[PDB]
Design an enzyme around this catalytic site. Structure first.
Site, PDB file in Angstrom:
ATOM      1  N   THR A  15      34.769  30.414  39.614  1.00  0.00           N
ATOM      2  CA  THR A  15      36.049  29.756  39.381  1.00  0.00           C
ATOM      3  C   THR A  15      36.556  29.977  37.962  1.00  0.00           C
ATOM      4  O   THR A  15      37.761  29.963  37.727  1.00  0.00           O
ATOM      5  CB  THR A  15      35.948  28.239  39.628  1.00  0.00           C
ATOM      6  OG1 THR A  15      35.620  28.003  41.003  1.00  0.00           O
ATOM      7  CG2 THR A  15      37.263  27.548  39.289  1.00  0.00           C
ATOM      8  N   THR A  73      30.143  27.986  39.784  1.00  0.00           N
ATOM      9  CA  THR A  73      29.401  26.735  39.644  1.00  0.00           C
ATOM     10  C   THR A  73      28.463  26.413  40.797  1.00  0.00           C
ATOM     11  O   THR A  73      27.390  25.849  40.584  1.00  0.00           O
ATOM     12  CB  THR A  73      30.345  25.501  39.501  1.00  0.00           C
ATOM     13  OG1 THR A  73      31.156  25.380  40.680  1.00  0.00           O
ATOM     14  CG2 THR A  73      31.236  25.628  38.268  1.00  0.00           C
TER      15      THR A  73
HETATM   16  C1  LIG Z   1      35.628  26.737  41.902  1.00  0.00           C
HETATM   17  C2  LIG Z   1      34.807  25.754  41.063  1.00  0.00           C
HETATM   18  O1  LIG Z   1      33.587  26.323  40.616  1.00  0.00           O
HETATM   19  C3  LIG Z   1      34.854  27.238  43.111  1.00  0.00           C
HETATM   20  C4  LIG Z   1      33.861  28.305  42.708  1.00  0.00           C
HETATM   21  C5  LIG Z   1      32.708  28.500  43.691  1.00  0.00           C
HETATM   22  N1  LIG Z   1      33.203  28.846  45.012  1.00  0.00           N
HETATM   23  C6  LIG Z   1      31.752  29.550  43.149  1.00  0.00           C
HETATM   24  O2  LIG Z   1      30.555  29.230  43.122  1.00  0.00           O
HETATM   25  O3  LIG Z   1      32.193  30.654  42.757  1.00  0.00           O
END
Ligand SMILES: *[C@](*)(CO)CC[C@@H](N)C(=O)O
Ligand SMILES: *[C@](*)(CO)CC[C@@H](N)C(=O)O
Ligand SMILES: *[C@](*)(CO)CC[C@@H](N)C(=O)O
Ligand SMILES: *[C@](*)(CO)CC[C@@H](N)C(=O)O
Lengths: 324, 324, 324, 324
Positions: free
Chosen positions: C12, C92
């Site tokens: 993200t 994350t």
């Molecule tokens: C956005 C907040 O981290 C979503 C990201 C998640 N899908 C990942 O682990 O890339």
């Protein structure tokens, strides 16, 4: 769309610094309300907003007399048919004090939402813009009515009675460890979790629309070797009440007891709270003064000041502390 | 089998009440050290224990001069080859102050373990027995050496520099929100998690051998309408230092600033901490006094008092606060 | 100025959405590393930065074989005299898994700092810019050496062994409830609080530089009515190890026990962890399988996989879980 | 005095070990209900109590078929004029599952209070006695009516909808990080803090009278390299629903998506929750299945099973999840 008025009072949310990297030692309450609104145009899609500049100061300087004026103004606004809710921008340091005061004095079910920011508007990754948008969403949602005064920041919605700044410098500083949040805002959707089980707003007996000031109340800390002379000083300067941020469950040293005795003989109401940060200060007939239930020192002072505008009867005041 | 001395000072762990249902308003520092040991015979299987009654009071009455003596006695005991560690029973209210004091003044790597209880010994489901058993286990484990002074309670091992009583009345009150615990004790086994990254014990410059008194340091609270007269009072009573349990990150009102300026003019050292409960009070050249780093008001006062036994130089004191 | 390599993998922090209000359902790993660097040019005054696009994916798709290559590339980088540290941008969701893997496999004391963001780069009040600035500050500070792999976000520094994403959608999601943070970053200054008391990096036996694949380890949940067939399925699909995210302290139902016993009979190594989120799963000789100490399921799987590359001996694997 | 039935099912609160130091590996559900009552005779001063032995098992073995009988037995009891409330002794491991089930199926406003203990009855400082006493006090208090099902332990009153076992082995394990406690019990007095803002008990549409079994629902974990074959396995065993304890906000890997698509094609209802432990899993049209709001995996499975006793319509089930 709902008609929401954004009443600005100052704070870091309206703060600024020379560099985007300066997140401390900046100037709070330097930016005007329209500047904050203009920085987040998206709010106009959430409500018809109107900015009003009540004040522009660092909240460490917010005073009872001014908080009183703030409460009276919000009451006038909420009395209007063309106003559906109010968002109050305020400094984080004493927002829990101003919020709890209005929590007890606003005579309306329309949403009153305090919003703040831990990073100045000029900072990299400033939290103010998002906090403001969230506050307006909460203030304009019909489901937000009758929930008591709220404090919105970092995707959370805390009750003015429980929420407190628990950390000196973090974005997630506002928490109610034992009571949780009334709700949260994720993905532009509000999730309400709790309804506070205490008296507030429309069901509060506290009305201050006919006052211009409040009874004086000071806070004395509890710790090893705490001095009796501080109680002497407070009494001497005419306090009407003393909130004790006591060791543990409002426990008192021999010196603290001597000082409280003197205060009581002078008609001063003594309220025992705690320096710990959370929890219940239980009744104890072997100790002087009243007990603050789960109210922390800052909150206890606010309620005691308001309690003193209606009575000086210890029993009535004690009940207030167990129900508000 | 390790030789452990259990040094008793009082507290709820040695508290009593007429009934097993009374968990508040009881008498702290009521029971003798051998009564505590015999109530949990299992400690004798973990070590060769020896009870010593240092004092027997409620910790709200613990004073700096007495803590000074406690530290000197522990240093004395740990200098003996027939003593492997010391467990100190203490009231919960100010154990964090006494614990941090010894954390800075005991020059030994041998375990110094403060232990306490939130329910009196006579209460239903009293926590003291298990807390004491755990404390003795930690004090006698050789893996417990060189970790600084610890506070053991509710299966947790907290560093004296981080641990604080966060709740007025719960069993799990002792926490270090941002710093966590040094270790935990589950199923009679110790699990060490962290080593504090600060100076203490054998690497501390705070020698208190032979002293019989400590510099006077008082604590003033920060809140809306905080009075300037409290500073006047402290100054008039010859304090050497003032710890400010301030709003947010040690923010100061115009009244607080006036008071601090007077204090500094009189040679009083001003230390800005926070009333919030956690976090960093960052340096700010635009504000008066020093900053407490992550030390809360209670811990800040202890370190300032010890700092003042060696210097009055603000720069040296400030570096102490960033390293201890 | 230190030489810092920013190794991008996606997430993200490099996410985009059509609007600034879109904070959920966006596209992760959409922006390139150089776009991240130029977006927060302030990093250039903290170090001489060099971006490297290792990959660009949503961390939910990060795989063991890819993490293996990441650890190998990081080892390569840190072996260079012209590299002082590395910052790794990662999603994350599984950052705690990749971070703990490198925590065990990077043979260097130079800082390895994972950084992430909960809001996409296009969101108002996006947290990525500040998190990255902080990550670089940590990676380039000489005081950051030999602390094991760290995860930096929301002004906090967490150890890869303890830190975990505790909340599905909040900025302050990363926490180590019982172990706290290694340190914090406030006012552009680093405050180191703890040093993890576990083996890692330069003192680790887990060298995987000569590997291209890892032992298969699946995680099965524990709950009322949990089925035996999930174990049969895992076994039939050649798992070398099974991590049990069990009820309480790895407690097992009659069905789970049957499943674990079939697994053990078939040569699979069983590791009992917990679904609770925190704490110790203690040894229990009346239950089959090994226990995970304080490692949660995600972390336990990583350590078990790596352990299986060196041994199939239960006694050895168990000691790893108590020391890493 | 109020008439309270103590319905026993087993658990550590009824656990026993050969020594007082053994707090792990003990036998749960070993002691009878009358034994627990006679251990805490103080309960009889709070109410006229009657023990009933529903079962005596470790909660890891509690099954839906038995929980159905528990709910039906409690509904039966509360329908009686002579029963003012019911206290249910249960193991800590799955009490959140059993409690949330009754929270959704008990059609009465009378208090339903689950109670448990983390230390066996034979342990030093056993928590069971006080926990039981507090549970009886909560169940017999008039102020406790209409608050939904509660879980009482360690001086805290938690809502069945929010409370969860967060630590594998600590006394203070039960918490609702974001939602707080409904109230606390300190000094023999109840302090009610919140009322949950969700549907439950008397307002629930989940009628289970006549049912002897519930739709099959299994839970699959989300992690790096999560296998598609576990979805195949669940489908093969005819599950009606699958709760996904996902990475982050219920994020899904390519394998998880493939597996979910197969399940949906087969009519299985897919519910995306989170492995993190707290927070909202927001709606996302780009991903398969429904989202669990703030329900964690264990709670989500319970609600999904009950949702399936009414309909298989995804839109309706999704609404159940946003309102219960
Ligand atoms: C956005 C907040 O981290 C979503 C990201 C998640 N899908 C990942 O682990 O890339
Ligand atoms: C900036 C973070 O809130 C500092 C603002 C504070 N002094 C205030 O209360 O206004
Ligand atoms: C009992 C719980 O700690 C109260 C004891 C306290 N007043 C003390 O500090 O001794
Ligand atoms: C003892 C602590 O709760 C262990 C009990 C647990 N296995 C259960 O759920 O009964």
């Amino acid at each position: 769309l709902p008609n929401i008025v954004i009443l600005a009072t100052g704070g870091t949310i309206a703060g600024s610094a020379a560099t985007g990297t300066q997140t401390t030692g900046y100037k709070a309450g330097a930016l005007g309300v329209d500047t904050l609104i203009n920085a987040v145009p998206e709010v106009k899609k959430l409500a018809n907003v109107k900015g009003e500049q009540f004040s522009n100061m660092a909240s460490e300087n917010m005073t009872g007399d001014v908080v009183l004026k703030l409460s009276q103004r919000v009451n006038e606004l909420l009395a209007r048919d063309d106003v559906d809710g109010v968002v109050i921008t305020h400094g984080t340091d004493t927002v829990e004090e101003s919020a709890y005061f209005l929590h007890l004095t606003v005579k309306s079910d329309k949403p009153v939402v305090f919003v703040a920011a831990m990073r100045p508007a000029t900072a990299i990754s400033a939290d103010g813009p998002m906090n403001l948008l969230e506050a307006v969403r909460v203030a304009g949602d019909k489901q937000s009515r009758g929930r008591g005064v709220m404090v919105v920041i970092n995707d959370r919605i805390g009750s003015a009675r429980y929420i407190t700044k628990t950390n000196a410098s973090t974005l997630d500083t506002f928490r109610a460890n034992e009571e949780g949040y009334l709700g949260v805002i994720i993905g532009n959707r509000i999730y309400y979790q709790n309804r506070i089980d205490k008296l507030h707003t429309t069901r509060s007996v506290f009305d201050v629309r006919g006052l211009t000031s409040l009874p004086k109340v000071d806070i004395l800390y509890g710790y090893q070797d705490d001095p009796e002379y501080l109680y002497d000083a407070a009494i001497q300067h005419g306090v009407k009440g003393i909130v004790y941020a006591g060791m543990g469950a409002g426990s008192v040293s021999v010196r603290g007891i001597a000082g409280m005795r003197k205060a009581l003989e002078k008609g001063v109401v003594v309220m025992r709270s705690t320096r710990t940060g959370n929890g219940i200060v239980p009744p104890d007939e072997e100790l002087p003064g009243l007990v603050s239930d789960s109210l922390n020192p800052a909150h206890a002072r606010i309620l005691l000041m308001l309690a003193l505008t209606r009575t000086s009867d210890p029993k009535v005041i004690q009940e207030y502390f167990h129900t508000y």
